[PDB]
Amino acid sequence: RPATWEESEEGALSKATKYFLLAEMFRGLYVVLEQFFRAPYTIYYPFEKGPVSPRFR
């Protein structure tokens, strides 16, 4: 059975803190920002070339 509000482990103030301060949204923004400091994948065609195999048609 789904649990009701009165059987919740977290107090209402902690939940309100998560609600008003957008905790998981901030985690998502941080994950996006981490990518900004990683190496990009781009190659500079036609000066560089993607992989080609002997079977290519």
């Binding site: 900004f36 400091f37 190496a39 990009p40």
Partner: protein, 86 residues
Amino acid sequence: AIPFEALLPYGIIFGLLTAGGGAMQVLHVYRNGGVRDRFAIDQWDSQMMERDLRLNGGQGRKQVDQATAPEAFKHNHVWKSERPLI
């Protein structure tokens, strides 16, 4: 690493705003005759600056600290003649 090509346009924007503001500050000071601008001036300040113009010979914001006014200060008083607000 820090991607510097992605920072180049931000650097252009930052440099443009910085240089424009510095140039504007220099132009304002030059327009003022070597002092900083007046800001947030009320009616009192406005009248005081008009009186200053009467005392320093029309030299903008130039100040004189001599106790006694010149003779011309007696006769260069201005009233304003305002057109009828129809």
